Amino acid sequence: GVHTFEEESTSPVPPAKLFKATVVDGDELTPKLIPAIQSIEIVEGNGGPGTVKKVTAVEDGKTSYVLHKIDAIDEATYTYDYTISGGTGFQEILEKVSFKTKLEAADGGSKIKVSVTFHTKGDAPLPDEVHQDVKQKSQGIFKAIEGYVLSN
Ligand code: NA
């Protein structure tokens, strides 16, 4: 099953700066800013398309690993597409979640365009709680980084 949503939002942060913090420096900043996220390490690749990363998260004694694949990256157009999977036992209905992200200049800051694709096991629909939990975590991580840029 394939379930698609789009979100548009703004930032006061200009796109180059927002792209560098979110995507180029995301592996450095995310474990530093999000208590629950222990580490982000390269499993395979050179940081270009096809690169797989392991994100280690701990909450309430419970340690979980989601894998993160780069599908596309282009710094000139602030394009970053990636796929999240793994975390066995964590939210069982998802095979994988594909993000397409793009930033552009608006009024001295950024316009942020996100497209997300939830891939379910075998034609299941997308539960509300799972969509909300994935949206909250990805918005939360991007905003935490966005706030960090504004705080320096
Ligand atoms: Na952390």
CSV table of N, CA and C and ligand atoms in Angstrom, one decimal:
chain,number,residue,atom,x,y,z
A,1,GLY,N,0.9,-1.2,0.0
A,1,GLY,CA,0.0,0.0,0.0
A,1,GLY,C,0.9,1.2,0.0
A,2,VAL,N,0.4,2.3,-0.8
A,2,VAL,CA,1.2,3.5,-1.0
A,2,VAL,C,0.3,4.7,-0.6
A,3,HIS,N,0.7,5.5,0.4
A,3,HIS,CA,-0.2,6.5,1.0
A,3,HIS,C,0.6,7.8,1.1
A,4,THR,N,0.2,8.9,0.4
A,4,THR,CA,1.0,10.0,0.1
A,4,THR,C,0.4,11.3,0.7
A,5,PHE,N,1.3,12.2,1.3
A,5,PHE,CA,0.8,13.5,1.8
A,5,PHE,C,1.8,14.6,1.3
A,6,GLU,N,1.4,15.8,1.3
A,6,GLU,CA,2.3,16.9,1.0
A,6,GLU,C,2.1,18.0,2.1
A,7,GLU,N,3.2,18.7,2.5
A,7,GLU,CA,3.2,19.8,3.4
A,7,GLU,C,4.1,20.9,2.8
A,8,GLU,N,3.6,22.1,2.9
A,8,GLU,CA,4.4,23.3,2.6
A,8,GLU,C,4.5,24.2,3.9
A,9,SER,N,5.6,24.7,4.2
A,9,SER,CA,5.8,25.6,5.4
A,9,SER,C,6.9,26.6,5.1
A,10,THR,N,7.1,27.6,6.0
A,10,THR,CA,8.2,28.6,5.8
A,10,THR,C,9.2,28.5,6.9
A,11,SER,N,10.4,29.2,6.7
A,11,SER,CA,11.4,29.5,7.8
A,11,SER,C,11.8,30.9,7.6
A,12,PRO,N,12.2,31.6,8.7
A,12,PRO,CA,13.0,32.8,8.5
A,12,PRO,C,14.5,32.5,8.0
A,13,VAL,N,15.0,31.3,8.2
A,13,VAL,CA,16.3,30.9,7.8
A,13,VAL,C,16.4,30.8,6.2
A,14,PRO,N,17.4,31.4,5.6
A,14,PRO,CA,17.6,31.3,4.2
A,14,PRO,C,17.9,29.9,3.7
A,15,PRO,N,17.7,29.5,2.5
A,15,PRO,CA,17.7,28.1,2.1
A,15,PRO,C,19.1,27.4,2.2
A,16,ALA,N,20.2,28.1,1.8
A,16,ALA,CA,21.5,27.6,1.8
A,16,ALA,C,21.8,27.2,3.3
A,17,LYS,N,21.6,28.1,4.2
A,17,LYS,CA,21.9,27.9,5.7
A,17,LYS,C,21.1,26.7,6.2
A,18,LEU,N,19.8,26.7,5.9
A,18,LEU,CA,18.8,25.7,6.3
A,18,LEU,C,19.2,24.3,5.8
A,19,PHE,N,19.6,24.3,4.5
A,19,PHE,CA,20.0,23.0,3.8
A,19,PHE,C,21.3,22.5,4.5
A,20,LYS,N,22.2,23.4,4.7
A,20,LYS,CA,23.5,22.9,5.3
A,20,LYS,C,23.3,22.3,6.7
A,21,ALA,N,22.5,23.0,7.6
A,21,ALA,CA,22.2,22.5,8.9
A,21,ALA,C,21.5,21.2,8.8
A,22,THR,N,20.4,21.2,8.1
A,22,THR,CA,19.4,20.0,8.0
A,22,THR,C,20.1,18.8,7.3
A,23,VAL,N,20.8,19.0,6.2
A,23,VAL,CA,21.1,17.8,5.4
A,23,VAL,C,22.7,17.6,5.5
A,24,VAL,N,23.4,18.6,5.2
A,24,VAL,CA,24.9,18.5,5.2
A,24,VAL,C,25.4,18.1,6.6
A,25,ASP,N,24.9,18.9,7.6
A,25,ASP,CA,25.3,18.7,9.0
A,25,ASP,C,24.3,17.9,9.9
A,26,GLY,N,23.3,17.4,9.3
A,26,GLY,CA,22.2,16.7,10.0
A,26,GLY,C,22.8,15.5,10.8
A,27,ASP,N,23.8,14.8,10.3
A,27,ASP,CA,24.3,13.6,11.0
A,27,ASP,C,25.1,14.0,12.3
A,28,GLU,N,25.7,15.2,12.2
A,28,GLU,CA,26.4,15.8,13.4
A,28,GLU,C,25.4,16.4,14.4
A,29,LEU,N,24.4,17.2,13.9
A,29,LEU,CA,23.6,18.0,14.8
A,29,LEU,C,22.5,17.1,15.5
A,30,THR,N,22.0,16.1,14.8
A,30,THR,CA,20.7,15.4,15.3
A,30,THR,C,21.0,14.7,16.6
A,31,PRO,N,22.1,13.9,16.7
A,31,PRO,CA,22.4,13.2,18.0
A,31,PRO,C,22.7,14.2,19.1
A,32,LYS,N,23.2,15.4,18.8
A,32,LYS,CA,23.6,16.5,19.7
A,32,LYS,C,22.3,17.1,20.3
A,33,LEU,N,21.3,17.3,19.4
A,33,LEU,CA,20.1,18.1,19.7
A,33,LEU,C,18.9,17.3,20.2
A,34,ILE,N,18.8,16.1,19.8
A,34,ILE,CA,17.6,15.2,20.1
A,34,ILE,C,18.1,14.2,21.2
A,35,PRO,N,17.6,14.3,22.5
A,35,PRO,CA,18.1,13.4,23.5
A,35,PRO,C,18.0,11.9,23.1
A,36,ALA,N,16.9,11.5,22.5
A,36,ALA,CA,16.5,10.1,22.2
A,36,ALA,C,17.4,9.5,21.1
A,37,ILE,N,18.0,10.3,20.2
A,37,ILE,CA,18.8,9.8,19.1
A,37,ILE,C,20.3,9.7,19.5
A,38,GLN,N,20.8,8.5,19.7
A,38,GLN,CA,22.2,8.3,20.2
A,38,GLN,C,23.3,8.6,19.2
A,39,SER,N,23.0,8.2,17.9
A,39,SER,CA,24.1,8.2,16.9
A,39,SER,C,23.5,8.0,15.5
A,40,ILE,N,24.2,8.5,14.5
A,40,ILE,CA,23.9,8.3,13.1
A,40,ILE,C,25.3,8.0,12.4
A,41,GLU,N,25.4,6.8,11.9
A,41,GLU,CA,26.7,6.3,11.3
A,41,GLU,C,26.4,5.8,9.9
A,42,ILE,N,27.3,6.0,9.0
A,42,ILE,CA,27.3,5.4,7.6
A,42,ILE,C,27.5,3.9,7.7
A,43,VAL,N,26.6,3.1,7.2
A,43,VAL,CA,26.7,1.7,7.0
A,43,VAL,C,27.4,1.4,5.6
A,44,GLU,N,27.0,2.1,4.6
A,44,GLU,CA,27.6,2.0,3.3
A,44,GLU,C,27.4,3.2,2.4
A,45,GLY,N,28.4,3.6,1.6
A,45,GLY,CA,28.4,4.7,0.6
A,45,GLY,C,29.3,5.8,1.0
A,46,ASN,N,29.3,6.8,0.1
A,46,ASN,CA,30.2,8.0,0.2
A,46,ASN,C,29.5,9.3,0.5
A,47,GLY,N,28.2,9.2,1.1
A,47,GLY,CA,27.4,10.4,1.4
A,47,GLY,C,26.6,10.9,0.3
A,48,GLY,N,26.7,10.3,-0.9
A,48,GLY,CA,25.9,10.6,-2.1
A,48,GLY,C,24.7,9.6,-2.2
A,49,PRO,N,23.9,9.7,-3.3
A,49,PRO,CA,22.8,8.8,-3.5
A,49,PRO,C,23.2,7.3,-3.4
A,50,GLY,N,22.4,6.5,-2.6
A,50,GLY,CA,22.6,5.1,-2.3
A,50,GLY,C,23.2,4.9,-0.9
A,51,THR,N,23.8,5.9,-0.3
A,51,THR,CA,24.4,5.9,1.0
A,51,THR,C,23.3,5.4,2.0
A,52,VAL,N,23.6,4.4,2.8
A,52,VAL,CA,22.7,4.0,3.9
A,52,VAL,C,23.4,4.4,5.3
A,53,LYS,N,22.6,4.9,6.2
A,53,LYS,CA,23.0,5.3,7.5
A,53,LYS,C,22.2,4.5,8.5
A,54,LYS,N,22.8,4.2,9.7
A,54,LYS,CA,22.1,3.6,10.8
A,54,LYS,C,21.9,4.7,11.9
A,55,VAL,N,20.7,5.0,12.3
A,55,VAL,CA,20.2,5.9,13.4
A,55,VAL,C,19.9,5.1,14.6
A,56,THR,N,20.7,5.2,15.6
A,56,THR,CA,20.5,4.5,16.9
A,56,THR,C,19.7,5.5,17.8
A,57,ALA,N,18.6,5.0,18.4
A,57,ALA,CA,17.7,5.8,19.3
A,57,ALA,C,17.5,5.0,20.5
A,58,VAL,N,17.5,5.6,21.7
A,58,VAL,CA,17.1,5.0,23.0
A,58,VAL,C,16.0,5.8,23.6
A,59,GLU,N,15.0,5.1,24.1
A,59,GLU,CA,14.0,5.6,25.0
A,59,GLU,C,13.5,4.6,26.0
A,60,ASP,N,13.4,5.0,27.3
A,60,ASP,CA,12.9,4.2,28.4
A,60,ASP,C,13.5,2.8,28.5
A,61,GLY,N,14.8,2.7,28.2
A,61,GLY,CA,15.6,1.5,28.2
A,61,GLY,C,15.6,0.8,26.9
A,62,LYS,N,14.9,1.3,25.9
A,62,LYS,CA,14.6,0.5,24.7
A,62,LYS,C,15.4,1.0,23.5
A,63,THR,N,16.3,0.2,22.9
A,63,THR,CA,17.2,0.7,21.9
A,63,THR,C,16.8,0.2,20.5
A,64,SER,N,16.7,1.1,19.6
A,64,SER,CA,16.1,0.8,18.2
A,64,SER,C,16.9,1.4,17.1
A,65,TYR,N,16.9,0.8,15.9
A,65,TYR,CA,17.8,1.2,14.8
A,65,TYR,C,16.9,1.4,13.6
A,66,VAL,N,16.8,2.6,13.1
A,66,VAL,CA,16.1,2.8,11.8
A,66,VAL,C,17.2,3.0,10.7
A,67,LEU,N,17.0,2.5,9.5
A,67,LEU,CA,18.0,2.7,8.4
A,67,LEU,C,17.5,3.8,7.6
A,68,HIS,N,18.4,4.6,7.1
A,68,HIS,CA,18.1,5.9,6.3
A,68,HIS,C,19.0,5.8,5.0
A,69,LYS,N,18.3,5.7,3.9
A,69,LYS,CA,18.9,5.7,2.5
A,69,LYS,C,18.8,7.0,1.8
A,70,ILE,N,19.9,7.5,1.3
A,70,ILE,CA,19.8,8.8,0.4
A,70,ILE,C,19.2,8.3,-1.0
A,71,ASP,N,18.1,8.9,-1.4
A,71,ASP,CA,17.5,8.5,-2.7
A,71,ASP,C,18.0,9.6,-3.7
A,72,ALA,N,18.1,10.9,-3.3
A,72,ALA,CA,18.6,12.0,-4.2
A,72,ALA,C,19.1,13.1,-3.3
A,73,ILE,N,20.1,13.8,-3.8
A,73,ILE,CA,20.7,15.0,-3.0
A,73,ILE,C,21.2,15.9,-4.1
A,74,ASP,N,20.8,17.2,-4.0
A,74,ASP,CA,21.4,18.2,-4.9
A,74,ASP,C,21.5,19.6,-4.1
A,75,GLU,N,22.7,20.0,-3.7
A,75,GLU,CA,22.8,21.2,-2.9
A,75,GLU,C,22.4,22.4,-3.6
A,76,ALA,N,22.6,22.5,-4.9
A,76,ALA,CA,22.2,23.7,-5.7
A,76,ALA,C,20.7,24.0,-5.6
A,77,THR,N,19.9,23.0,-5.5
A,77,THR,CA,18.4,23.2,-5.5
A,77,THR,C,17.8,22.7,-4.2
A,78,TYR,N,18.7,22.6,-3.1
A,78,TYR,CA,18.2,22.2,-1.8
A,78,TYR,C,17.3,21.0,-1.8
A,79,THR,N,17.6,20.0,-2.6
A,79,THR,CA,16.9,18.8,-2.8
A,79,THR,C,17.5,17.7,-1.9
A,80,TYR,N,16.8,17.1,-1.0
A,80,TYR,CA,17.2,15.8,-0.3
A,80,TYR,C,16.0,14.9,-0.2
A,81,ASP,N,16.1,13.7,-0.9
A,81,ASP,CA,15.1,12.6,-0.8
A,81,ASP,C,15.7,11.4,-0.1
A,82,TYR,N,15.0,10.9,0.9
A,82,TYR,CA,15.6,9.7,1.7
A,82,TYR,C,14.4,8.8,2.1
A,83,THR,N,14.8,7.6,2.4
A,83,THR,CA,13.9,6.5,2.8
A,83,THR,C,14.3,6.0,4.2
A,84,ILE,N,13.3,5.9,5.1
A,84,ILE,CA,13.4,5.3,6.5
A,84,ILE,C,12.8,3.9,6.5
A,85,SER,N,13.5,3.0,7.1
A,85,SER,CA,13.0,1.6,7.3
A,85,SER,C,13.8,1.0,8.5
A,86,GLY,N,13.4,-0.2,8.9
A,86,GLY,CA,14.0,-0.9,10.1
A,86,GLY,C,13.1,-0.7,11.3
A,87,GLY,N,13.8,-0.5,12.5
A,87,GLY,CA,13.0,-0.5,13.7
A,87,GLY,C,12.1,-1.6,13.9
A,88,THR,N,12.6,-2.9,13.8
A,88,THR,CA,11.6,-4.0,13.9
A,88,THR,C,11.0,-4.0,15.3
A,89,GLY,N,9.7,-4.2,15.3
A,89,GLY,CA,8.9,-4.2,16.6
A,89,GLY,C,8.4,-2.8,16.9
A,90,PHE,N,8.8,-1.8,16.2
A,90,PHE,CA,8.5,-0.4,16.7
A,90,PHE,C,7.1,0.1,16.1
A,91,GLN,N,6.9,0.1,14.8
A,91,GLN,CA,5.6,0.4,14.2
A,91,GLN,C,5.3,-0.6,13.0
A,92,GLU,N,4.7,-1.7,13.3
A,92,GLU,CA,4.9,-2.9,12.5
A,92,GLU,C,4.2,-2.8,11.1
A,93,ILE,N,3.3,-1.8,10.9
A,93,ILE,CA,2.5,-1.8,9.6
A,93,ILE,C,3.3,-1.2,8.4
A,94,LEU,N,4.4,-0.5,8.8
A,94,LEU,CA,5.2,0.2,7.7
A,94,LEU,C,6.2,-0.7,7.2
A,95,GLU,N,6.4,-0.8,5.8
A,95,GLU,CA,7.6,-1.3,5.2
A,95,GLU,C,8.7,-0.2,5.3
A,96,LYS,N,8.3,1.0,4.8
A,96,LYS,CA,9.3,2.0,4.6
A,96,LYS,C,8.5,3.4,4.4
A,97,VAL,N,9.2,4.5,4.7
A,97,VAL,CA,8.6,5.8,4.5
A,97,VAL,C,9.6,6.6,3.7
A,98,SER,N,9.2,7.1,2.5
A,98,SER,CA,10.0,7.9,1.5
A,98,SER,C,9.6,9.4,1.6
A,99,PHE,N,10.6,10.2,1.9
A,99,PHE,CA,10.6,11.7,2.0
A,99,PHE,C,11.2,12.3,0.7
A,100,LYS,N,10.5,13.2,0.1
A,100,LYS,CA,11.1,14.1,-0.9
A,100,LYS,C,11.0,15.6,-0.3
A,101,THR,N,12.1,16.2,-0.2
A,101,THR,CA,12.3,17.5,0.5
A,101,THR,C,12.9,18.5,-0.5
A,102,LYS,N,12.4,19.7,-0.5
A,102,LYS,CA,13.0,20.8,-1.3
A,102,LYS,C,12.8,22.1,-0.7
A,103,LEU,N,13.8,23.0,-0.7
A,103,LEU,CA,13.7,24.3,-0.1
A,103,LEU,C,13.8,25.4,-1.2
A,104,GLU,N,13.1,26.5,-1.1
A,104,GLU,CA,13.4,27.6,-2.0
A,104,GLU,C,13.4,29.0,-1.3
A,105,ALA,N,14.0,30.0,-1.8
A,105,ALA,CA,14.0,31.3,-1.2
A,105,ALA,C,12.5,31.8,-1.1
A,106,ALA,N,12.1,32.3,0.0
A,106,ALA,CA,10.9,33.2,0.1
A,106,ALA,C,11.2,34.3,1.1
A,107,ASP,N,11.1,35.6,0.6
A,107,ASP,CA,11.1,36.8,1.5
A,107,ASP,C,12.3,36.8,2.4
A,108,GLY,N,13.5,36.4,1.9
A,108,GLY,CA,14.7,36.4,2.8
A,108,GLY,C,14.8,35.1,3.6
A,109,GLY,N,13.8,34.3,3.7
A,109,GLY,CA,13.9,33.0,4.4
A,109,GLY,C,13.7,31.8,3.4
A,110,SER,N,13.1,30.7,3.9
A,110,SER,CA,12.8,29.5,3.1
A,110,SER,C,11.3,29.2,3.0
A,111,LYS,N,10.9,28.7,1.8
A,111,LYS,CA,9.7,27.9,1.6
A,111,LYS,C,10.1,26.4,1.7
A,112,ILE,N,9.5,25.6,2.5
A,112,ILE,CA,9.9,24.2,2.7
A,112,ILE,C,8.8,23.3,2.0
A,113,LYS,N,9.2,22.5,1.1
A,113,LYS,CA,8.2,21.6,0.5
A,113,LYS,C,8.6,20.2,0.8
A,114,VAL,N,7.7,19.5,1.5
A,114,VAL,CA,7.9,18.0,1.8
A,114,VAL,C,6.8,17.2,1.1
A,115,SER,N,7.3,16.1,0.5
A,115,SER,CA,6.3,15.1,0.1
A,115,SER,C,6.7,13.8,0.8
A,116,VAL,N,5.7,13.1,1.4
A,116,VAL,CA,6.1,11.9,2.1
A,116,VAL,C,5.2,10.7,1.6
A,117,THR,N,5.8,9.5,1.5
A,117,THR,CA,5.2,8.3,1.0
A,117,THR,C,5.3,7.2,2.0
A,118,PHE,N,4.2,6.8,2.6
A,118,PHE,CA,4.2,5.6,3.5
A,118,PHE,C,3.9,4.3,2.7
A,119,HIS,N,4.8,3.4,2.9
A,119,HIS,CA,4.6,2.1,2.2
A,119,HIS,C,4.2,1.0,3.2
A,120,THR,N,3.0,0.5,3.0
A,120,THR,CA,2.5,-0.5,4.0
A,120,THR,C,2.6,-1.9,3.5
A,121,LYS,N,2.6,-2.9,4.5
A,121,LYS,CA,2.6,-4.3,4.1
A,121,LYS,C,1.3,-4.6,3.4
A,122,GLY,N,1.4,-5.1,2.2
A,122,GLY,CA,0.3,-5.9,1.6
A,122,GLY,C,-1.1,-5.2,1.6
A,123,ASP,N,-1.1,-3.9,1.1
A,123,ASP,CA,-2.4,-3.2,0.8
A,123,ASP,C,-3.2,-2.8,2.0
A,124,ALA,N,-2.6,-2.8,3.2
A,124,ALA,CA,-3.1,-2.2,4.4
A,124,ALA,C,-3.2,-0.7,4.3
A,125,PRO,N,-4.3,-0.1,4.8
A,125,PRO,CA,-4.3,1.4,4.9
A,125,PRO,C,-3.4,1.9,6.1
A,126,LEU,N,-3.1,3.2,6.1
A,126,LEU,CA,-2.2,3.9,7.0
A,126,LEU,C,-2.9,4.2,8.3
A,127,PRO,N,-2.6,3.6,9.4
A,127,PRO,CA,-3.2,4.0,10.7
A,127,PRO,C,-2.9,5.5,11.0
A,128,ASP,N,-3.8,6.2,11.6
A,128,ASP,CA,-3.7,7.6,12.0
A,128,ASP,C,-2.5,7.8,13.0
A,129,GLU,N,-2.4,6.9,14.0
A,129,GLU,CA,-1.4,7.1,15.0
A,129,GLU,C,0.0,7.0,14.4
A,130,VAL,N,0.2,6.1,13.4
A,130,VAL,CA,1.5,5.9,12.7
A,130,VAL,C,1.8,7.1,11.9
A,131,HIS,N,0.9,7.6,11.1
A,131,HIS,CA,1.1,8.8,10.3
A,131,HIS,C,1.5,10.0,11.3
A,132,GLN,N,0.8,10.2,12.4
A,132,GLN,CA,1.1,11.3,13.3
A,132,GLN,C,2.4,11.1,13.9
A,133,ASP,N,2.8,9.9,14.3
A,133,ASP,CA,4.1,9.6,15.0
A,133,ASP,C,5.2,9.9,14.1
A,134,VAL,N,5.1,9.4,12.8
A,134,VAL,CA,6.2,9.7,11.8
A,134,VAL,C,6.2,11.2,11.5
A,135,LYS,N,5.1,11.8,11.3
A,135,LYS,CA,5.1,13.3,11.0
A,135,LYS,C,5.7,14.1,12.2
A,136,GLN,N,5.3,13.7,13.4
A,136,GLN,CA,5.8,14.5,14.6
A,136,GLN,C,7.3,14.3,14.7
A,137,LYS,N,7.9,13.1,14.4
A,137,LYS,CA,9.3,12.9,14.6
A,137,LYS,C,10.1,13.7,13.5
A,138,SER,N,9.7,13.6,12.2
A,138,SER,CA,10.4,14.3,11.2
A,138,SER,C,10.3,15.8,11.3
A,139,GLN,N,9.1,16.3,11.5
A,139,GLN,CA,8.9,17.8,11.7
A,139,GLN,C,9.7,18.2,12.9
A,140,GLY,N,9.7,17.4,14.0
A,140,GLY,CA,10.3,17.7,15.3
A,140,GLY,C,11.8,17.8,15.1
A,141,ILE,N,12.4,16.8,14.4
A,141,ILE,CA,13.9,16.9,14.1
A,141,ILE,C,14.3,18.1,13.3
A,142,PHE,N,13.5,18.3,12.2
A,142,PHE,CA,13.8,19.5,11.3
A,142,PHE,C,13.7,20.8,12.1
A,143,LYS,N,12.7,21.0,12.8
A,143,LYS,CA,12.5,22.2,13.6
A,143,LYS,C,13.5,22.4,14.7
A,144,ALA,N,13.9,21.3,15.4
A,144,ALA,CA,15.0,21.3,16.4
A,144,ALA,C,16.2,21.9,15.8
A,145,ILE,N,16.6,21.4,14.6
A,145,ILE,CA,17.8,21.9,13.8
A,145,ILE,C,17.5,23.3,13.4
A,146,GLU,N,16.3,23.6,13.0
A,146,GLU,CA,16.0,25.0,12.5
A,146,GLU,C,16.1,26.0,13.6
A,147,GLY,N,15.6,25.6,14.8
A,147,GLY,CA,15.8,26.4,16.0
A,147,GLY,C,17.2,26.5,16.4
A,148,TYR,N,18.0,25.5,16.3
A,148,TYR,CA,19.4,25.5,16.7
A,148,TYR,C,20.1,26.6,15.8
A,149,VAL,N,19.8,26.7,14.5
A,149,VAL,CA,20.4,27.6,13.6
A,149,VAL,C,20.1,29.0,14.0
A,150,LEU,N,18.8,29.3,14.4
A,150,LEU,CA,18.3,30.6,14.9
A,150,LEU,C,19.0,31.0,16.2
A,151,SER,N,19.4,30.0,17.0
A,151,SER,CA,19.9,30.3,18.4
A,151,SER,C,21.4,30.5,18.4
A,152,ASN,N,22.0,30.6,17.2
A,152,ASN,CA,23.5,30.8,17.1
A,152,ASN,C,23.8,32.0,16.2
B,1,NA,NA,21.2,12.5,21.5
